Design a protein around this ligand. Structure first.
Ligand SMILES: [Ca+2]
Ligand SMILES: [Ca+2]
Ligand SMILES: [Ca+2]
Lengths: 373, 373
């Protein structure tokens, strides 16, 4: 018997607003100048956004427009009124970004596991499915009374590595003041969010019949986002990745262009791990890549299969080194990373996404691995 | 045959400046009102500090003094001139903190391992020893030409879990513009920083005779800190903990009062794991604690010993449940957390410190565990 809990948040959570604004600036610059170098951090607090950092780009028009990119992103998230705690059209926006016209000892991790169709650990996969659906029923008008800020927590009970029970689900969501928590919110969330996600997943062993469901356990949640709070870019890196189930090297993703190895190699490592698992080489795998200063190619590639391998782990390591080219330049080319694809990654997780198609989630190396093992 | 790399940074690194400022504010508030509730975030970029968030406190004088607390912390770090890229006496300081007068589904981790006297993984333990000594030789006048910003990277080679070789050390440090990199910095850092740390540690198996040493491999490093950069609180959470060696639930520490379980329970988990290893019950251990909403005491406690246990892992779990009271109220009492002890934690790691005495590092439960096993 083990319990494992992971968490996700909606795009309206103040830290996630920051990640999305940072990545929205990044996408605007890449769309006009694919070689842009970008290190952009966002802060939010009551009624203000502060965007800072450094850019090297030829995309002068997009750079000029950053103030409008900020506002439009916030509006798209759904903050369009002080009654909601925040209004993208009228909040303060301050830009302190340095602008110009035109490496590491490292140990990066990737992970995949056959507990879900998307090959992610179940607690985080379910938490992200729930937070994404919470947003979906607001935006599609099914529960139009919802507001952007929200959080999901999923606790799974395991016996001998098998997920056997959905122990607890917590869903906190912002909403209009006049909504009855017990008569309206609780059954609507159970029906439109929890039940539809569980149906979608159709898990083979997860028994959800006795789940303890807590919807807004602390009561009314009328104001949200930056209101009476603060958020920063890169403060949800466990939410962005594997929900605590896998190890983390420490780099945040959002607001960084693909030349930042923190981002692109983390994406490659997910890609490698996912294809290893999808190929049938192991039921779960953590993949490690070792980099050296002055060398482009890795100096080490190590697999941990936690006893779950179907073949010698040393053979898996050799097959990876044969199939994948993990030089940064090769990664950037092969995953086609110099494109404005990043704003969608800034909430609901960078890995295992069921609603968007990301290059590092493609199972396009399964055949190659099978031929090389 | 495995490599592992971890990194540390000095108190002058821009992310760490933010953590230090956040915890300096926290300390000032706790010194006058131990019951203060604090969620304070700090951002820095070229020439400015922006401190935001929320506070509930009776410490009105301390709150009024926040602008001076900021400046004094930055001066203490060593930024006192535009020549260094930043001056605490004359930079921009903007305070946007809400102020007034007067739980979760969770799974937190702690880790310990017998690879160092401080019972921390060797790569991060050495990286922190190095970054701390780099600061020390600047402040004590031995290498007075150094400036605050700096970074260390340590790569260790392992054979069957034994640390056998110090593979690579990178030390990057800020310094005055008139310093010769080859004639001065290179041998000074090797002699005063690397050599002294390795002599201090006197490791039993780590062979350092063939170490690749890189001092400032990208050359001159004259401006630093926030200059031409940006930092935010809570962007070094892996540096703050186990250097990527252990799993992380996701919460940052700095700028949060001890009622934040993200902070206090992480500290108690380290305390638990450290006492387990010190008691000789396992050579390495990850301890996980599961909390439920509406319940003070944990609903689960799990021990992973990675095959290194001296006794049944299950007997270790039982002894922990008997010896430790992991209710947050108990943890705050027993570790005596409502005191201004946090500013020193904000750089060089929260765990495994050789230069300061922290309550969650005391081996005061080794005897208890031995009697309960
Ligand atoms: Ca809030
Ligand atoms: Ca293929
Ligand atoms: Ca810098």
């Amino acid at each position: 018997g083990r319990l494992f809990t992971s968490e996700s948040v909606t795009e309206g959570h103040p830290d996630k607003i920051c990640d999305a604004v940072s990545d929205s600036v990044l996408d605007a610059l890449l769309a006009a100048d694919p070689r842009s170098r970008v290190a952009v951090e966002t802060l939010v607090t009551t009624g203000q956004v502060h965007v800072v950092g450094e850019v090297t780009t030829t995309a002068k028009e997009a750079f000029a427009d950053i103030t409008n990119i900020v506002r439009e992103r916030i509006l798209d998230i759904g903050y369009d009124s002080s009654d909601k705690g925040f209004d993208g059209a009228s909040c303060g926006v301050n830009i302190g970004i340095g602008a110009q016209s035109p490496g590491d000892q490292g140990l990066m991790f990737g992970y995949a596991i056959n507990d879900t169709p998307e090959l992610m650990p179940l607690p985080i996969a379910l938490a992200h499915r729930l937070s994404r659906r919470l947003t979906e029923v607001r935006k599609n008008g099914v529960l139009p009374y919802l507001r952007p800020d929200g959080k999901t927590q999923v606790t799974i009970a395991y016996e001998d590595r098998v997920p056997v029970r959905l122990d607890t689900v917590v869903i906190s969501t912002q909403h209009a003041d006049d909504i009855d928590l017990v008569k309206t919110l609780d059954p609507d969330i159970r029906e439109q969010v929890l039940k539809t996600v569980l149906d979608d997943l159709a898990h083979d062993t997860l028994d959800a019949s006795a789940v303890r469901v807590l919807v807004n356990p602390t009561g009314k949640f009328v104001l949200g986002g930056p209101m009476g709070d603060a958020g920063l870019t890169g403060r949800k890196i466990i939410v962005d990745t594997y929900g605590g189930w896998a190890r983390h090297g420490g780099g945040a993703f959002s607001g960084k262009d693909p030349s930042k190895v923190d981002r692109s190699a983390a994406y490659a490592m997910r890609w490698v791990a996912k294809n290893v698992v999808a190929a049938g080489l192991a039921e779960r795998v953590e993949v490690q890549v070792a980099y050296a200063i002055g060398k482009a190619a890795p100096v080490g590639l190590f697999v941990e299969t936690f006893g779950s391998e179907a073949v010698d782990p040393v053979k898996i390591e050799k097959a990876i080194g044969e199939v994948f080219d993990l030089r940064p330049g090769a990664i950037i080319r092969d995953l086609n990373l110099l494109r404005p694809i990043y704003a969608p990654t800034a909430a609901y997780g960078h890995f295992g996404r069921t609603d968007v198609d990301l290059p590092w989630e493609r199972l396009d190396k399964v055949d190659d691995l099978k031929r090389a093992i």
